[PDB]
Amino acid sequence: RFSSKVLNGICAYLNRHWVRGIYEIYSLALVTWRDCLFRPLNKQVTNAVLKLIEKERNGETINTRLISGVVQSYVELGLPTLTVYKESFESQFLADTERFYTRESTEFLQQNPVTEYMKKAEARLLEEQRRVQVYLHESTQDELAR
Amino acid sequence: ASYHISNLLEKMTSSDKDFRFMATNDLMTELQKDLDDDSERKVVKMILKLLEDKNGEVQNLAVKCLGPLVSKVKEYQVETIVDTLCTNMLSDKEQLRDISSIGLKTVIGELPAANVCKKITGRLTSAIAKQEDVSVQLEALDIMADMLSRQGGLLVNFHPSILTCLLPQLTSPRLAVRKRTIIALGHLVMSCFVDLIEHLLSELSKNDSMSTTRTYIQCIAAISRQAGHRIGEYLEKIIPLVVKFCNVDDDELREYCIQAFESFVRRCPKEVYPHVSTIINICLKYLTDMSWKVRRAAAKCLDAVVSTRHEMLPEFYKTVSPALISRFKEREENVKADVFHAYLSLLKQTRPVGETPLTMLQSQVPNIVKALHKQMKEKSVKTRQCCFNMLTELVNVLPGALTQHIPVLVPGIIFSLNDKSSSSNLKIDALSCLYVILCNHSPQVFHPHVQALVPPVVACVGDPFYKITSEALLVTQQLVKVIRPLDQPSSFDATPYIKDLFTCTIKRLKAADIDQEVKERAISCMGQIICNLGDNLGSDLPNTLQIFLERLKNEITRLTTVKALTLIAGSPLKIDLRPVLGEGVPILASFLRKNQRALKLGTLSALDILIKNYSDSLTAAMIDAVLDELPPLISESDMHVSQMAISFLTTLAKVYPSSLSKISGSILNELIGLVRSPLLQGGALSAMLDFFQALVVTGTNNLGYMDLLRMLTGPVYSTHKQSYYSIAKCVAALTRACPKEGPAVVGQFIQDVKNSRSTDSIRLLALLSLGEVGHHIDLSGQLELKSVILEAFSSPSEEVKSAASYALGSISVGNLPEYLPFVLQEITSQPKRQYLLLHSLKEIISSASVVGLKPYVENIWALLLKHCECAEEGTRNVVAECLGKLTLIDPETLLPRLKGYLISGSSYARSSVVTAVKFTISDHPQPIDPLLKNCIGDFLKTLEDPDLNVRRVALVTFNSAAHNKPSLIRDLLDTVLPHLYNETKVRKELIREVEMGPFKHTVDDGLDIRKAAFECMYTLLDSCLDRLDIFEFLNHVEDGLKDHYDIKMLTFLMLVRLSTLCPSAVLQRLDRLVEPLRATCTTKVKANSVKQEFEKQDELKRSAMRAVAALLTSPLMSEFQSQISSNPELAA
Secondary structure (H helix, E strand, O other), X not given: OHHHHHHHHHOHHHHOOOOOOOOOHHHHHHHHHHHHHHOOHHHHHHHHHHHHHHHHOOOOOOOHHHHHHHHHHHHHOOOOOOHHHHHHHHHHHHXXXXXXXXXXXXXXXXXXXXXXXXXXXXXXXXXXXXXXXXXXXXXXXXXXXX | OHHHXXXXXXHHOOOOHHHOOHHHXXXXXXXXXXXXXXXXXXXXXXXXXXXOOOOHHXXXXXXXXXXXXXXXXXXXXXXXXXXXXXXXXXXXXXXXXXXXXXXXXXXXXXXXXXXXXXXXXXXXXXXXXXXXXXXXXXXXXXXXXXXXXXXXOOOHHHHHHHHHXXXXXXXXXXXXXXXXHHHHHHHHHHHOOHHHHHHHHHHHHHHOOOOOOOHHHHHHHHHHHHOOOOOHHHOOOOHHHHHHHOOOOOOOXXXXXXXXXXXXXXXXXXXXXXXXXXXXXXXXXXXXXXXXXXXXXXXXXXXXXXXXXXXXXXXXXXXXXXXXXXXXXXXXHHHHHHHHHHHHHHHHHHOOOOOOHHHHHHHHHHHHHHXXXXXXXXXXXXXXXXXXXXXXXXXXXXXXXXOOOHHHHHHHHHHHHHOOXXXXXXXXXXXXXXXXXXXXXXXXXXXXXXXXXXXXXXXXXXXXXXXXXXXXXXXXXXXXXXHOOOOOOOOOOOHHHHHHHHHHHHHHHOOOOOOHHHHHHHHHHHHHHHHHOOOOOOOHHHHHHHHHHHHHHOOOOHHHHHHHHHHHHOOOOOOOOHHHOOOOHHHHHHHXXXXXXXXXXXXHHHHHHHHHHOOOOOOHHHHHXXXXXXXXXOEOOXXXXXXXXXXXXXXXXXXXOOOOXXXXXXXXXXXXXXXXXXXXXXXXXXXXXXXXXXXXXHOOOOOOHHHXXXXXXXXXXXXXXXXXXXXXXXXXXXXXXXXXXXXXXXXHHHHHHOOOOOOHHHHHXXXXXXXXXXXXXXXXXXXXXXXXXXXXXXXXXXXXXXXXXXXXXXXXXXXXXXXXXXXXXXXXHOOOOHHHHHHHHHHHHHHOOHHHHOOOOHXXXXXXXXXXXXXXXXXXXXXXXXXXXXXXXXXHHHHHHHHHHHHHOOHHHHHHHHHHHHOOOOOOOOOOHHHHXXXXXXXXXXXXXXXXXXXXXXXXXXXXXXXXXXXXXXXOXXXXXXXXXXXXXXXXXXEEEEOOOOOOEEEEOOHHHHHHHHHHHHHOOOOOOOOOOOHHHHHHHHHHOOOOHHHHHHHHHHHHHHOOOXXXXXXXXXXXXXXXXXXXXXXXXXXXXXXXXXXXXXXXXXXXXXXXXXXXXXXXXXXXXXXXXXXXXXXX
């Protein structure tokens, strides 16, 4: 991205010479990055993050910078436009969170009373709100809230 | 219309009592629902004229209408109405004065404008001045008090005048005036400006030097109660005055006790408790009339002491407070009840969230029962009820206290129960206390009292009052278990009590339109009696049992009947239920249709226990009906019911394998579908595996091992990972059920070896099945396994590689001597594959038996240490995790070595060893608790100075420990706080920058540590705010507000969370907290920038607005310009 920005700054003169995928230098770089992400490479990275978040719920400390950068790259692509972010990680992440929370709730309610369940529900909701406000997009805040 | 109002006004001065009550009602109705100026003036004038009439009904109607009238009118009309009402209030006519006062009160209540309130307050201030008349003064005081209670926000620049006008009323000869002005001052204190409170306090302090006048103390108490947070700064000048005045001879200590209690309840922060504790103790003792309520106040004063304060429990116990409280138990009822309440509050506060409070309480227990013994002979029901409640509370707070006092307390209980004058409440309390004592005491100290406890219980059973009958039934049920406990051996001839206890119970079995609670209690008692004393009953056992069937039809006692049947079925004694089995089992099958989770579970458990205990007497008829309700019960919607159904099927197959050809209808299909359920986990998987194993052992046509394998792995040959795990585990369990399945392994090997005509799914499933089946059996006998496994390790996809590694790790557990060394040397052999092999080793330590792993520890440790220093970061992480997992075993042999490595180890070695111990922490208790607690000290304290990576890993480990187990960093938090605070500071030596034109980009090599420190600080808020100081904590946060975007959002969220915690500290510095925030919000996007920067700054601004909004819940907070004004509606 830094190289693309520098090149666009260098050749804006040529960028303003046509009459009319996209011809813009920044647009060309973003399209190239999107193409490089389309190949199965993403299937690893998008999958890898799913482990880290899970580890964050297992008492382990993970690196939030990597996930923040990955989410920023995903949201920036798709030319805000959130099509790729919505069809790539949003649905899978939401399904994984639903399944994990359902399993945890079932396991807890199987051998614990309701007061403890309420307390851990508060804890998990607060942790989820923290995660959303830290390293997730604002538009998803409501989506994962209700 | 105009004519309507005209004729209404014309008929309003009608001279007929009933024509002036209809017009007013019509006007009120028309005004209530949603009018020219002349009409408004005319109607207002008519209403004012009619306000004074010779009839009460019309006057009351006009007064009521005055309220809604002001709701829809201009300001001048309200002003003139108020003026005329105030002028009339000065008239000498009592009726007119009362009418005006009521109208003004109604107008004030109707209101939520400002000029009207100012004029009213001015008029009251002028009128309240010293005057001969008292009625007008009282009316004005009442109006002012009502206005203050309703409105207390406006009139900021009028408080001094009100205070000055009200002060002279304090010394009024009428006590009513003094009380009214005290109440008015207390109400006005809430409204106020802030500078007036200091003047009022100073005036009261200087006026305290007075003769015998209790008005000042009453006013002080009232203002303290109305506002305690604004008076805590002047206690040093008030406490000495009351302390010195307590020496007076006249009986006036009541006010001092009341104000002390109010201060204790409201103002918690103070250190003058012992100064007044002795005074209260001596005051409660003296007695010589008007001397009882002073004692009552002294006794009640200790209620706040015993309730609010809790850290001072031991000093209460060691002091003479409880001793005096127990000693003063033979006084009049009014003070005795308050003493009982105070000691009950103390006992309640004793229960928490050298010697512990419980041990000290027991030492005084012998001094309590005796003190209550005489109280058991009192004829007052209140004293007996208080004693019973005290005994119940004492037994509840700690069991095993009244062990050597049953002989002296039982007679009192019997005497109280046998008393005819005892009320229903007293009997209920006595029965509850007896039940609590029996349920929280050893049965061995109740046998001699059976003869004295059975007659009264039986007598209480025959009581028209239903609650007493229920209590007696519960006591009988408890005594049934206490007399003949099946958990421990006993030797006591209870046969003489078999008849009467039954007679009082069976008589209650026949409900015949009785209370539901009574029916439930009787059913429970009958079930308990049948379960415990089932052999003693003779010919009366069967017939009564038949009545249970009548209870299975109605839904009122269905759950209770099912629970009783389940309890009866499971018991050491052999009870014959066959006569009610054929007619009982089908009815239970009808309870699975209606949607009732509790009922479904109860009936399933009852059927399971009945089949397990009674398997010889069974018929296929009822079994078929029962099996029909299973298919709609095994589903992914509910997991608890699925496990119960699986267990029931397993039990039925185990004790009745004949009826296994009917489940093939839909039960097998449902089980197969549930096997691939993503939510399948927990005990349900184990239950299903056990059911499959039992089915394989039994054996049935079309349900053989080959058929089961084909049905399970049928669709795969012709999607969720948990489904693959479940299928592999089921295959492994089925293979284990048959110890001779040689062909299966060779077939799986052939299928896996054939790359062609075998997609990734089949290979993954085969590898998972091989790994699952190779754990509990040894596969070293068959060759060609290592070669194919190693060949499969190299594949394009990663899922297959991970599955192969997991399978190899699981298989290595089987034959450790033959597999562990092979992988150990293979790790060093190839450098391009060890990264996978190491992962397999991670399973061994987590899957292999520790006793069997003892011999192969030194080699693994040496390999890990040799591979600890590696260029690859992933390999370093893997070896660190392996070392951490291995550190769990024999900690006493490894911990000293780890401590030693920190004295001369390298940076990489230190990082690896500190990372290894990070994973040792677990949420649940572990046997390495004290060892880790003692070891983590030097790890956390003296290992953050030298290096950067070492600092980062230490901070990460500290954060992980705080998140999982914060008790380890509880005693050393202060010892590490300086280092953590220092690490938060930014370093400009570790910030590199490269510039190649107008653009600029800054790279920071130390930003990772700052993020870890901030995360640790945030996570420390869980259960450590009570220890760490606030002032020294928020300075670094204030400095860090101006930091990186991620840190900025984290700090904003910290501030949002801090809004509900210690708001006083946040408010004391809001100015400097928000100043950097305002500076950031006043930032502008750099010109000629990509949309990414615009969006990033937009989210930063929204987060800042959310933070300030949360904090708000006036340093130039009104800065809403043209554009920003459109932002807030998007945030809220």
